[PDB]
Every structure is written in structure tokens, then in C-alpha cells.
Design a binder for these strands. Structure first.
Ligand code: ZN
Lengths: 99, 128, 154, 60, 78, 110
RNA sequence: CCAUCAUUUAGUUGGGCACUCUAGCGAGACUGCCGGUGACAAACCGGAGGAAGGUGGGGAUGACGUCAAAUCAUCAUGCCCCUUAUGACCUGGGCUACACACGUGCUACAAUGGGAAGUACAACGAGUCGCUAGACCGCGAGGUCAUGCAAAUCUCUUAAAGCUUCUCUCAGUUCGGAUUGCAGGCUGCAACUCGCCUGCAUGAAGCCGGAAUCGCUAGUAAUCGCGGAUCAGCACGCCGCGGUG
């Protein structure tokens, strides 16, 4: 509703931590923030041969999960915009605010 | 009205079943169970809980099913119908319990391993 | 195996006739896991049995089974470098196993234009002490009760 | 010859269908992943040491 | 299947246009085995490099849609 | 005699018996029988002398005869007498399309 | 997502988070109770309850050592060798050659089948100069105008075996689809040597395979399709997924 967040990360611990940060500092100055809704956690898969020259019949498999989290804000106020676009922690987590 | 709801799972398929007093009939996904699963006789697998306990009518059955194949999502329907019958009267948890009809079948598709043709079939060998 | 004997693989009695024997017969006709085709075949065959000079498909089927199953089978063994064969008894499950196996194998080799025209005809010929299945049983009984010679002290 | 060929790989190609990928640490031309720009067995080497962010060993 | 106009090379077509006037020379020596035989190549004698040498091929009329490489093989069996 | 060239078989439907003339496959028989209006009806050739002449006059507009074998023959003949790489292979019993001859000539060379 | 309500082509729009689902945090399985065997011991056999019972099912995890096993061509590196050439740049040709022998696969030898019409049911994954909705043109592979989407929102994607009708009749055949002729499409500066696909025509061997030999103990074997890494294009190979069983 005319303001909403999106957060991607590789660790759900950091993800939930920052989601609680934003939810708390949002409902401190406003009201009615839709919960941190979870999204379905994309996954990839990489198979590789673990030997430099021969032996195709023995491999090692890797992956990279990407956790997702959604937060929608209802009825912002000329102070929520301020108190939201300023908090920034932590480092390796993607934030994308679309109106 | 009064109604009874249960949830049934089998082999990548999940069903949502509703028991309602009536005259004995079942419709699934807005079609008739004679047409939705018209295979041969899987219906006689579905109507087994009514056959063993709460013998045998009369409830119209309304189900919402999605996932798996035609033979998985009928064992799932059976699972759900049994759970719903259990909900009606708890005294049924013995006759049903004796004849299976209450457990989830945890027989899923085994995963493929590398270096093998399938989950367990290996390549052809030659001693020389 | 090596550890010791194993279980018996419980079967699920088919709902039409409520008979575990029809279940195993469906399982033996089936090839490649296409089970609905095998079921249609068995049911058309029983319809053909009852419609034409029949009483009930279970009755004539049981009698055909009784006339085909063996009661004395031999086993070719090795001792120390010379091999022979000796008769032995036959436990019950192996009996019905062999019966079903022979009936299906020798109906599959008939030479008509439908598996039903073969199966119904063959188990009718069997319930009247005829057909290569009964002759296979009698070959077995004749091999036994003769090769008891080098079996009398085995 | 593997020092002139890395040089020849980085100059602009003479035709559209003449460019090809190589590894960036080494110059291996076979089996390179084009999300990382790493070959078959530098991936397995930098996955250990936890340098590539994301990637880890999979089991299920 | 170049239904968007068949394919010659500029050097080859330049040379053939240049000789189009009078009676022709056997010295049209090009590598160019990808070019097709346009209906103006008739009567000349093209030299087609086969990876080792320059084989001459005389262009009759029945050869009018094929390529210049179809008349100079490369393998040398028996 | 029978309805084209020689000897369209008996006892079969026309949509299949018409296949037996060199140059008539399966869709061509359909199109020929449809430009007239003849069906199969049922598993026999019990036509009329108007149906035979009907399905006879239209085959004349195609190349279904020993007029086709001539075309194919003289095509391979033109091939092998210019250069020609395809014809050179036609003259050795070897695959003429690029086939990596390790087994793929048992058809082409027996 | 749609159970209690109105509404339309419809979960769509008003409404709701009940159910399914998604994903964080917890519970639950321990021979833990009950009977017998056994040196009363460890352990084994049977029962109750429960979704699950005896390491519930599967993965990752590979000791001291053996074969001077494999790799100076992923990368490094001691010693030796070349240096107006064993270094370097370009076009065209092999790497795809064919009297044959060996290994690993795919398609079949048909009626538990081939052909025509109708009706159904999944899961894992991929996408910005990419995935293409829809409408039209072409018998077809495809083409044109155009639309949504950086994605639980749009697309790839109506899965194939299956089921129901109508045929065909035991034949080298309405089985099989090798090989060859002609005409096209797509990517690419360019498909002769040497690509994939389409249509019409042709229609080979093959009627279940000796000695010998291989895989597999349950959602497994057998059978059926779908996705993506690599990649303009190019898969019967490889890695995964689910259906019938
Ligand atoms: Zn590398």
C-alpha cells in the first residue's frame, strides 16, 4: 500500500534480524505494518568433477540458497519516511524499497 | 449446515475433503468422481472407509485435490475421507486403525545418485 | 540371504472378487507396470468364461489351478565336481507361484488374436485336464519319481 | 603456448562467433561457469576457504 | 540455404567481373571454397586451394548451383 | 489394369492399395481420393467402372510410373559426371551425407 | 489460498487468513513401557499406543596403509633442452579419414500393437537485450505486427504413458524407418569437406538373437515424459525431477 520493502540474503538469521529492526522502528512511529511474510527460497545446484584429469564417475555437488522476505507498510507518515530511509545495517543483505 | 473436514496426503498429492450428510456420492474439482478418476476401479479403493466403519452411508463427499498422478491423488482422497470420519465420532479410531486407513504412506521417489544410471541401477560391466 | 529367512511380501486383495489369487494373476500378466491393461484383460477373460459355458469365474479358475499346480519338483545340485538331480517336496507358496507362471507363459504362446481369447480359452482347457500346462506338470512328475534313483540317499 | 593465447583472447574478436570464454585465474578454456567466470577446478578450490559468497556443499 | 541472395566473395566476383569482357585466363587463383557457382563463372578455370595445393576446375554448365569446394577434395584415399 | 500402371491389389481399401504404385505414398493417396469423393467402405475394393476411371484419370497428372525412376536415375547420373564429391561417394557405396564411417555403411555397403 | 457470502469468462472484485501453501521457532522415537527366550547379563522374538519402531528412508562424512596406480596439458616447480626458432601473426585444411576388430548406448522385430477423433492428472528448474502472451499468414519447420514481466504476480509449460470411441486382421504387413532424389526454414561474415529441423517421394536388415556374460532386495527393477549446465546454432551423452508400478 504505497510503500513496501524487499530483503534478500543468504542467511535467515541476519534476514530475520534486520526485518525485526525495520518492523520495530516502523511501528514505533506509526502503525499497521504487515508482517514479515516469507517467500519461497530459491535454490541452485552445481555439479563438478573433483579430479584434474580423469575419473568422471565421482563428483562433488554444490549449491547456493537465497532467502527472501517481504514487508508492506500501511498508512505512512511524514516521519516514517525519515525514520526508515536512514537505518542501514547490515552489510550483505539486499534492500529495495518500491513505492 | 454441519460439515466435517480433513486433509489427506500421499506421494506429492494433497487433498482437502468435506463430509456432509446426504445420500452417498462424491464430486471432485466440480466434476463427478465417475468422470474425474474414470480409470477402472480406484473408486472401490476410495469407498473403503465407509465400507469398514460408519457402515456405510450416507454422506455426500466434496473434495479439492491437486498434485501427483491419478493413482496418488486417490489414495490421498481415501486418507482424507478416513480422517474426516474419525472426526465425526472418535469411537471409529479402532476399526479404522486395524485396517490401515489411518496412516500416511511415506514412500516417496528416491533421489538419483551420481555415477549411477538411476537411484540404484548401475552401468553395464565387463571383467575384461 | 546369508543372515536368515525373510518376510513374505503381503498382497492387497483386489476389490472386485475379493480374492488375493486374482491379484497375483493380474500382477503376472502385467508388463512394464501398465496395470490397467492387465486388469482389463483379466476382466474381459472372466466375462468370456462366464458368458460361454460357465458357472462362475472363481470356481473354474480354482479348479484349473488345482489341476496344474505341481506336487513333486526336483533340484539339480552339485556335490564335488559331478552334478546330478534329486527330487524334493514343494512348499505351498512355490506351488501357486509355479501354477500361475505356467498358465500365463503357455497362454502367451497360444496363437489367437487377443490375450483374452488366449487366457480364457487356456484356463478352460486347464480346468478339463488339458493344455500344455497340465502336460508340463506331468513332465515334472515323470522326471521326479524316476530320478529318485540317484536321490534315495541324498 | 598459453601466454599469447590469453592476450589473443582479450583483444576484440574478428567476428561475432569468434569470442570464447576462458578462466580468469588460469586460462583454462574448457568447462567454465559464466556466472563466476571460473573453471571446473578453481571453483572447487575457492569454495573451500569460503571466498565465493553463497556457494557451499549440498546434500539432501 | 541463403534464400536471401546466394553467397559469393567480393574478391572472386571482382576478378570475374574484370575478365567478363574478352576470352578468359586460367589464373583465377583463390582460396574461397565457400562460394557458389554463379551462372557467370562458365567457361573460366578457377583454381581452388584444397589445404595443400591449387587444383584447377573447369566450369561447365551442369555445375551452376554447387560450391567451389565440391570439385577439389581434401582427403586422399588410395 | 489395374487402375494405374499395373495391379493395384485386391481385398484391401483403396487408401492403402493405392500405395503400391511407385510415387504414391500415403498423403498423396488421400488427396487423390479426395479430389474425387471416393471413400474406403469398407475393407474391400468393390468400386465401379466410374470410380476406377475416376481414380485413374487423376493419377495421370502425377509422375507415378517408370517416368519417375528415369528422373532419379539421371539425377544421380548428372551427379557422378561433373566433379563431384557426392557422386564420387555414390560410386563407392559409401554414405553421401557425412556419416562417420565406423558402422554406418552396413546399409550402404552390405 | 477460497470454507460461511454477492459477482462475473474465471479467485476476479468487495471480503476473510478458516483450509492448502510458503518459512522462522518448538514438539515427536528413546528398546521408552507390556510377555517370552537366553548365564537373571548384553541381545533376540511378540504386543500396546502412535504419522512413524528397533541405526523410520536417503545424502554428506572415507583411519593407519596398498598399487614408484593417474596427472609437468588446470596450476606451480628442481634439473635438462630451443632461442632470426621448439617463439610469434594469417588464410585453407585434418582432429569427422575406412578391407576390419572391441566397449557403451538408442530404435525395433508388432495386436499387452499401428492409425484417426475426444477427455484428464505433476515436480525440479530458467529468463533483460532474455523468457514471448495474443491476433494473423504458411500443410509444416516457422514468419509479421505486437504484449507482460528483472519475477509465489508474466512467460518458458494444455507433460507423455493413461481413459473413451472408430478402424485395421497375423502378413516382411497400414510392423520397422536405415538409405537415397527434390524443395524449404533457422542461427551465423560463411553450413562443400562438416550443423540442426520441415514436407513430398523411396521403403534395407530385422519375425526375439549360441558359447558366454551384466543390473537390481521396494516406491526398488521395468516403463513414460519434463527441466539446465556448456551454448549464435548443435545431445541417443551427463546432472536432476516427477507419473504408472
Ligand atoms: Zn581456473
Amino acid at each position: 500500500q504505497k510503500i513496501r520493502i524487499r530483503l534478500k540474503a543468504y542467511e535467515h538469521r541476519i534476514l530475520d534480524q534486520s526485518a525485526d529492526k525495520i518492523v520495530e522502528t516502523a511501528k514505533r512511529t506509526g502503525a499497521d505494518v504487515s508482517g514479515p511474510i516469507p517467500l519461497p527460497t530459491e535454490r541452485s545446484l552445481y555439479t563438478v568433477i573433483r579430479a584434474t584429469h580423469k575419473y568422471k564417475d565421482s563428483r562433488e555437488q554444490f549449491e547456493m540458497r537465497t532467502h527472501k522476505r517481504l514487508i508492506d507498510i500501511v498508512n505512512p507518515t511524514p516521519k516514517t519516511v525519515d525514520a526508515l530511509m536512514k537505518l542501514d545495517l547490515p552489510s550483505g543483505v539486499n534492500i529495495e524499497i518500491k513505492l | 449446515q454441519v460439515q466435517y473436514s480433513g486433509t489427506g496426503r500421499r506421494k506429492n498429492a494433497v487433498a482437502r475433503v468435506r463430509l456432509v450428510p446426504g445420500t452417498g456420492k462424491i464430486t471432485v474439482n466440480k466434476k463427478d468422481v465417475e468422470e474425474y478418476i474414470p480409470h477402472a476401479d480406484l473408486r472401490e479403493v476410495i469407498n473403503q472407509p465407509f465400507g469398514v466403519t460408519e457402515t456405510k452411508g450416507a454422506y455426500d463427499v466434496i473434495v479439492n485435490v491437486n498434485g501427483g498422478g491419478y493413482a496418488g491423488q486417490s489414495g490421498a482422497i481415501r486418507h482424507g475421507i478416513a480422517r474426516a470420519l474419525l472426526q465425526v465420532d472418535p469411537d471409529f479410531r479402532s476399526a479404522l486403525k486395524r485396517a490401515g486407513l489411518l496412516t500416511r504412506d511415506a514412500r516417496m521417489v528416491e533421489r538419483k545418485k551420481p555415477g549411477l544410471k538411476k537411484a540404484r541401477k548401475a552401468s553395464q560391466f565387463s571383467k575384461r | 540371504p546369508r543372515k536368515g529367512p525373510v518376510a513374505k511380501r503381503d498382497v492387497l486383495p483386489d476389490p472386485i472378487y475379493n480374492s488375493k489369487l486374482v491379484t497375483r494373476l493380474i500382477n503376472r500378466v502385467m508388463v512394464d507396470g501398465k496395470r490397467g491393461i492387465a486388469a482389463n484383460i483379466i476382466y474381459n477373460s472372466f466375462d468370456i468364461i462366464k458368458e460361454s459355458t460357465g458357472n462362475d469365474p472363481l470356481e473354474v479358475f480354482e479348479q484349473a489351478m488345482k489341476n496344474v499346480m505341481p506336487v513333486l519338483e526336483v533340484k539339480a545340485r552339485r556335490v564335488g565336481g559331478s552334478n546330478y538331480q534329486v527330487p524334493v517336496e514343494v512348499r505351498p507358496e512355490r506351488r501357486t507361484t509355479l501354477g500361475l507362471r505356467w498358465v500365463v507363459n503357455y497362454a502367451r504362446l497360444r496363437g489367437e488374436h487377443t490375450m483374452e481369447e488366449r487366457l480364457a480359452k487356456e484356463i478352460m482347457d486347464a480346468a478339463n485336464n488339458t493344455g500344455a500346462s497340465v502336460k508340463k506338470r506331468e513332465d515334472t512328475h515323470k522326471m521326479a519319481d524316476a530320478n529318485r534313483a540317484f536321490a534315495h540317499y541324498r | 603456448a598459453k601466454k599469447s593465447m590469453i592476450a589473443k583472447n582479450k583483444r576484440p574478436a574478428k567476428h561475432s562467433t569468434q569470442a570464447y570464454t576462458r578462466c580468469e585465474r588460469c586460462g583454462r578454456p574448457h568447462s567454465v561457469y559464466r556466472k563466476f567466470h571460473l573453471c571446473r577446478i578453481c571453483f572447487r578450490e575457492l569454495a573451500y576457504k569460503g571466498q565465493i559468497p553463497g556457494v557451499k556443499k549440498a546434500s539432501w | 540455404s541463403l534464400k536471401k541472395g546466394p553467397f559469393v566473395d567480393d574478391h572472386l566476383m571482382k576478378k570475374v567481373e574484370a575478365q567478363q569482357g574478352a576470352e578468359k585466363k586460367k589464373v583465377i587463383k583463390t582460396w574461397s571454397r565457400r562460394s557458389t557457382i554463379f551462372p557467370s563463372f562458365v567457361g573460366f578455370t578457377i583454381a581452388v586451394y584444397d589445404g595443400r595445393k591449387h587444383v584447377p576446375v573447369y566450369i561447365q554448365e551442369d555445375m551452376v548451383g554447387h560450391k567451389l569446394g565440391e570439385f577439389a577434395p581434401t582427403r586422399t584415399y588410395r | 489394369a489395374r487402375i494405374a500402371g499395373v495391379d493395384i491389389p485386391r481385398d484391401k481399401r483403396v487408401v492403402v492399395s493405392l500405395t503400391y504404385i511407385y510415387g504414391i505414398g500415403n498423403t498423396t493417396a488421400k488427396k487423390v481420393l479426395a479430389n474425387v469423393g471416393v471413400s474406403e467402405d469398407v475393407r474391400v475394393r468393390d468400386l465401379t467402372n466410374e470410380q476406377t476411371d475416376a481414380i485413374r484419370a487423376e493419377i495421370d497428372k502425377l509422375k507415378v510410373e517408370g517416368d519417375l525412376r528415369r528422373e532419379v536415375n539421371l539425377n544421380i547420373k548428372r551427379l557422378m559426371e561433373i566433379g563431384s564429391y557426392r557422386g564420387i561417394r555414390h560410386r563407392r557405396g559409401l554414405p553421401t551425407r557425412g556419416q562417420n564411417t565406423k558402422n554406418n555403411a552396413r546399409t550402404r555397403k552390405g
